[PDB]
Design a protein around this nucleic acid. Structure first.
Ligand SMILES: [Mg+2]
Ligand SMILES: [Mg+2]
Ligand SMILES: [Mg+2]
Ligand SMILES: [Mg+2]
Ligand SMILES: [Mg+2]
Ligand SMILES: [Mg+2]
Ligand SMILES: [Mg+2]
Ligand SMILES: [Mg+2]
Lengths: 145, 106, 141, 56, 70, 143, 206, 56, 63, 65
RNA sequence: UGCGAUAACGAACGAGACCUUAACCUACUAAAUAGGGUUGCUGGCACUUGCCGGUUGACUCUUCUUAGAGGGACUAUCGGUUUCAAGCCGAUGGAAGUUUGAGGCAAUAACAGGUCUGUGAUGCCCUUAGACGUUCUGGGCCGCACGCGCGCUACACUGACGGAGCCAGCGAGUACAACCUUGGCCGAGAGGUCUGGGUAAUCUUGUGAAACUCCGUCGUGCUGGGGAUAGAGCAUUGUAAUUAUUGCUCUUCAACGAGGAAUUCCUAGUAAGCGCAAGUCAUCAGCUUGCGUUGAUUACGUCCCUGCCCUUUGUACACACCGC
């Protein structure tokens, strides 16, 4: 809509949630780049914040960033339906929750560990370093981790 | 005394086409003889039943197919005419192959 | 009572029925005017017959078309064909023959079918192949 | 009773075929050739063409 | 990245200097004369179409052909 | 002369309708705005985000006007398209049904849409009038 | 001149651009005479058509491809590659855009420019592989006018496609550029280069 | 078998066929399978004159 | 570039080991009545015109 | 390959032998005559025969055969 | 295939003819289960008479619809070309001038080709009551250092994503079951629910299918291209879903900047793209038989390759070169 007038040049590459938010580009894109946030989720976050998706937003404000962080942290406090999440329904009798960065990775690791402990078919597969979701490796994917 | 017109549709369904046509003609003639108000022999879209089948039993060799098909021919004759007359019509004009059938209820 | 004709137009499975009448000068299609159509590039094509004729002929004649079948382009083509037909038909009916002849000549000169209905219907996609003529893919390795 | 017309027709055909098969099986001694089925109201006429008619 | 995405006052000024000249201005044309990248270029073009300067030829999405007055 | 709804080139008309709705501020919000996909195949919610809904409503109204009597499933079908379903080829799956229903309800509340017999809905008088007005406005703008 | 009132009202500009002159899409189709025997009759600007789109039963007999319009041919050529295959409307649009670009650049008739480009692009002599025992000796052979034209049409399109592949330069613009190059026989374009190469090859095998 | 076939053919001819044909396939003596063809007159193989004319 | 503008009087058979070349007798545009049989690659017809570089060099049926 | 078949040709020849008069050059008339005469089951075949007859007539009109 | 030349003459089969379908019919016969015209009531407009509508209110029509009966194309007329033959080539008209397009059938002789896992088609052998019969239960056909074979998805700017525009044809679809399932409400979805309509030109269904078209957002960065593997939850089918059945929701973002040697398919509504469709089906489409939509490039030739066919040749071959 408008070309960025004024001096500009407000920080190339911001650091947020122990990860690299890329300068310029767009808020959603930055979120995606973070290890744990995706596209739709990012969009939702942006909407919640109340910033234009048109703006490149490496020239973002601090308050806005803080708000975003808060949103990331908390599903239930803000208006997020709580079945839109990465994780939901976990531990004994309790609540749905998700992380979005380093935190997300940690959570994933924990989950993996739990699975391993359980020794479920999926867990076993994971341990092996193999195909959890029953896809046929008779022909396909001949290299693997 | 009665002269009670129920408004009666004669259906005429078949595979064999010529025969069906003949039957229809006969019906029309009968109607003319009896001199009634009727809509002429309406012809509905010929529904075709298609069975595609691999020509083989064992599925070995080239992959050849046979589309076997059945032609259904469906005609309507709408009579603005009494019950007795309809009955009479039903009684006379019955041929082999054609499925003569009456709706009766407008 | 008024002088009128129903002229059909066609392309592949697309079908158009153009009702030509006397009056002010409507050229309508599915209720909406001639100007829209809305493939937008082929609006010109739709116009084309009219342009060839001249706007003078539509000051008397009133065309309103109903279109079915086909895709979009095909439909447009059908409509165009119908339009081409309709004027000619009208001329044949209620106007001098000379004019009609002239129109025909014009059409021939810029013949993108128009009066002649398009000959081509699609081929059956016979077995052993994804299209009609095209086959799958042999391998003897 | 009361089905799709086409379906009904198909069923009838199948029945006829079955009948034919039965005739082939059973009326071998009698020298059976073919069946003719006429489905009028009330009665249904099953005509049989065989060589040894008396036997049949 | 190949740069030509960074936004400045100076850059804006150079862009302005000027809408006049060039047979046609096309986002593509703008980039890369090495100007502000795609979206930015488009925005610039739009701005140029505010009050004269560059009049249009086409109006389509991405095929946006403009030319100098008058 | 005679002003009509069809003379306007569609998109423009829709835009006008949307604008009108915005001006009004009384089409009523569903509650799912920007926490909603709009179709079961669309890996990105509406880019307009705020608004958009109004436009959709307008479009629906237009469709209703065009046709005899329309329902929800049909609307969904009209709206939906191709899922980038994956490495698999594309099917056609229908759009957001609940959203459509909500839109319809809103329209009804406004006095655009009227409940029809047999099935579905048709158009109210006030709604029709509004549409006509919009068309006229569009024409004026064009002129 | 003379805007006649039809009940279904037509835009003013549209009305103006009708009847009096047998125009192209907006502007005139006249002039464009090649002045190069061979490429006359098989490059046909003689037939004035209003859009680069017909039903066109051209692929039927043999030489009816000649009488098919140049713009149409170009569009068809553009339509190449599976991703873009069919989709003639798109091609037409692209062509239109190209034409517009040409018009913008140094004024001039766009059609004329296109024709010039085509002319430039036709290779005079091409080689064809002969058996001749076993080895791959290539005898130089003269090119038939229609064939040459076809080749020219191809080459430009190919160049455009190449330009497009990973690029801002919208295919239409690339095409326009190519055409321009051809007109001012620069040997900066791709088609031209190809032609030159062909010529060289011919020279070598004579 | 051959004789029987011949007789059948003769009978057919008498009855009044334009032509007829009999195939007898299998182990007509010896373990290896043979086909044995016995025909008279014309025999239309191709076209619609087959369903109309030839009883199989 | 000295180029000779040629013209087709008679098609003298399809030639080559393969299909895509044709023998053609040629009466050139300027300085007429000097017939040469030359090979043409594409679709050829009577009264077609040929643009070429190396004129006076008669060709033969390719092996 | 529009080579008119052998049978058709033969038929045409026969027709010519029979009814040289009552075979006027033009086609529809010839066809009609053929229909009147010989028992052609098909329509297409009949048409073909008629065409052949016409051709023969034309040939004759430029000397014998 | 014919024309011709001719110890050959006239014939049959195969090809052709035939049949089905795809194209034409303001010429017939027809219709509130197909479509229109006038008019009633009736909604909105400009507000003059005029424009769009909605109603099976009336009256009438058959162009489109269907589908009965027929015609219509025979290479027709003209021009060349060819022993002025068979034919071929070009213009004209014509719906149609590629055998009008597409198939259906399709000879003689065969193959040790496949099928005894379609078969109460079956020889013989085996087996033959803790069966190699049957039947339950749990798996398995889906496993993975890795080869090839059909396929799909992409390597984006002729795009992607959003809106908006918005058009097909083949079909198919239940009463003893549980079929298609509009229309209304709940749900971001998937999907639930109530209600119908349909045994079907009537209802689903105009299957308002996609690819397309328009205006905007990213601009040529393994990027918003690309969507894999992944984790979680929400759904559904079924007795049973872990060895994700499938769907949906968020999250993960891998390889791949048009692919070497090789090799497939193709000549016009074709190729390629695009979706639909039934088939199998309780549930699953990347498959398949069809369908339509969008719709090109280049030949309209040749024997270079490949195969096949004949002829003349040579033959220690005849189980016939995998020969002797
Ligand atoms: Mg995609
Ligand atoms: Mg035969
Ligand atoms: Mg045959
Ligand atoms: Mg002649
Ligand atoms: Mg055929
Ligand atoms: Mg229906
Ligand atoms: Mg990415
Ligand atoms: Mg399958």
């Amino acid at each position: 809509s408008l070309v960025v007038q004024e001096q500009g040049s407000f920080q190339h590459i911001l650091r947020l949630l122990n990860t690299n938010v890329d300068g310029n580009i767009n808020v959603v894109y930055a979120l995606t780049t973070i290890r744990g946030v995706g596209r739709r989720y990012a969009n939702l976050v942006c909407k919640k914040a109340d910033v234009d998706l048109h703006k490149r937003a490496g020239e973002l404000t601090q308050e806005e960033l803080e708000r975003i962080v808060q949103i990331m942290q908390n599903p239930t406090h803000y208006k997020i339906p709580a079945w839109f999440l990465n994780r939901q329904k976990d531990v004994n009798d309790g609540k749905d929750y998700h992380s979005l960065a380093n935190n997300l990775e940690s959570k994933l690791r924990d989950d993996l560990e739990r699975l391993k402990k359980i020794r479920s078919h999926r867990g076993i597969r994971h341990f092996w370093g193999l195909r959890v979701r029953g896809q046929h490796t008779k022909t396909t994917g001949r290299r693997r981790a | 005394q009665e002269v009670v017109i129920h408004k009666i549709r004669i259906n005429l369904t078949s595979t064999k086409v010529k025969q069906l046509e003949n039957v229809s003609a006969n019906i029309i003639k009968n109607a003319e003889t009896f001199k009634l108000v009727k809509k002429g022999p309406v012809r509905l879209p010929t529904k075709v039943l298609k069975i595609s089948t691999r020509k083989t039993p064992n599925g070995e060799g080239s992959k050849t197919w046979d589309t076997y098909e059945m032609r259904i021919h469906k005609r309507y004759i709408d009579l603005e005419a009494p019950a007795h007359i309809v009955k009479r019509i039903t009684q006379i004009t019955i041929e082999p192959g054609v499925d003569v059938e009456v709706i009766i209820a407008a | 009572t008024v002088p009128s004709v129903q002229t059909f137009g066609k392309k592949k499975s697309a079908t158009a029925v153009a009702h030509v009448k006397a009056g002010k000068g409507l050229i309508k299609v599915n209720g909406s005017p001639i100007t829209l159509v809305q493939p937008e590039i082929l609006r010109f094509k739709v116009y084309e017959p009219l342009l060839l004729v001249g706007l003078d002929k539509f000051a008397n004649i009133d065309i309103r078309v109903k279109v079915t079948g086909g895709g979009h382009v095909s439909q447009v083509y059908a409509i165009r064909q119908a339009i081409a037909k309709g004027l000619v038909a009208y001329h044949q009916k209620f106007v001098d023959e000379q004019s009609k002849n002239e129109l025909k000549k014009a059409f021939t000169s810029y013949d993108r079918t128009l009066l002649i209905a398009d000959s081509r219907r699609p081929e059956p996609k016979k077995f052993g192949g994804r299209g009609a003529r095209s086959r799958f893919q042999k391998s003897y390795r | 009773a009361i089905i799709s017309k086409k379906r009904k027709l198909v069923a009838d055909g199948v029945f006829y075929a079955e009948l034919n098969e039965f005739f082939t099986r059973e009326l071998a001694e009698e020298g059976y050739s073919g069946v003719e089925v006429r489905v009028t109201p009330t009665k249904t006429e099953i005509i049989i063409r065989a060589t040894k008619v008396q036997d049949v | 990245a190949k740069h030509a995405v960074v936004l400045d006052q100076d850059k804006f000024d150079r862009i302005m200097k000027e809408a006049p000249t060039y047979r046609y201005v096309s986002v593509s044309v703008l980039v890369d004369r090495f100007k502000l990248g795609g979206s930015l270029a488009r925005v610039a073009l739009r701005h140029l179409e505010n009050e004269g300067i560059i009049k249009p030829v086409s109006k389509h999405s991405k095929q946006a052909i403009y030319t100098r007055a008058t | 002369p005679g002003v009509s709804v069809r003379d306007v080139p569609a998109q423009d008309f829709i835009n006008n309708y949307a604008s009108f709705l915005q001006r009004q501020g009384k089409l009523e919000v569903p509650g799912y705005v920007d926490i909603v996909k709009t179709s079961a195949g669309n890996e990105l919610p509406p880019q307009d985000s705020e608004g958009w809904f109004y436009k959709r409503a307008a479009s629906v109204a237009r469709h209703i006007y065009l046709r005899k009597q329309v329902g929800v499933g049909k609307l969904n079908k009209l709206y939906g398209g191709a899922k980038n379903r994956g490495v698999r080829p594309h099917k056609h799956v229908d759009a957001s049904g609940s959203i459509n229903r909500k839109v319809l309800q809103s329209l009804e509340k406004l006095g655009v849409v009227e409940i029809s017999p047999k099935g579905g809905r048709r158009i109210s008088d006030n709604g029709l009038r509004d549409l006509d007005r919009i068309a006229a406005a569009t024409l004026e703008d064009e002129e | 001149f003379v805007p006649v009132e039809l009940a279904t009202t037509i835009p003013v500009e549209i009305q103006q651009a009708q009847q009096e002159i047998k125009l192209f899409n907006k502007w005139s189709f006249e002039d464009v005479e090649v002045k190069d025997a061979s490429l006359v009759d098989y490059i046909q600007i003689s037939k004035p058509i209003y859009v680069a789109h017909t039903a066109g039963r051209y692929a039927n007999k043999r030489f009816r491809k000649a009488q098919c319009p140049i713009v149409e041919r170009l569009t068809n050529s553009l339509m190449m590659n599976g991703r873009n295959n069919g989709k003639k409307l798109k091609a037409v649009r692209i062509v239109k855009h190209t034409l517009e670009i040409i018009n913008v650049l140094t004024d001039q008739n766009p059609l004329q420019v296109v024709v010039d480009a085509i002319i430039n692009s036709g290779p005079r002599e091409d080689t064809t592989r002969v058996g001749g025992g076993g080895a791959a000796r290539r005898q130089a052979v003269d090119v038939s006018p229609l064939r040459r034209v076809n080749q020219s049409i191809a080459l430009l399109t190919i160049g455009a496609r190449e330009a497009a592949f990973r690029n801002i330069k919208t295919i239409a613009e690339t095409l326009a550029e190519e055409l321009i190059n051809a007109a001012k026989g620069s040997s900066t374009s791709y088609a031209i280069k190809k032609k030159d190469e062909l010529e060289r090859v011919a020279k070598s095998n004579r | 078998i051959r004789r029987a076939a011949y007789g059948v053919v003769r009978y057919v001819m008498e009855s009044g066929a334009k032509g007829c044909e009999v195939v007898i396939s299998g182990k007509l003596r010896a373990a290896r399978a043979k086909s044995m063809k016995f025909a008279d007159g014309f025999l239309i193989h191709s076209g619609q004159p087959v369903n109309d004319f030839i009883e199989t | 570039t000295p180029v000779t503008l040629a013209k087709v009087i008679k098609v003298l058979g399809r030639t080559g080991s393969r299909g895509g070349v044709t023998q053609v007798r040629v009466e050139f545009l300027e300085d007429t009545t000097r017939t040469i049989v030359r090979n043409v690659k594409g679709p050829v017809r009577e009264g077609d015109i040929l643009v070429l570089m190396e004129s006076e060099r008669e060709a033969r049926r390719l092996r | 390959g529009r080579v008119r078949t052998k049978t058709v040709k033969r038929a045409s020849k026969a027709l010519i032998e029979k009814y040289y008069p009552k075979l006027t050059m033009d086609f529809q008339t010839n066809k009609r005559l053929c229909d009147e005469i010989a028992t052609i089951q098909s329509k297409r075949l009949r048409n073909k025969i008629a065409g052949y007859t016409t051709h023969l007539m034309k040939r004759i009109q430029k000397g014998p055969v």
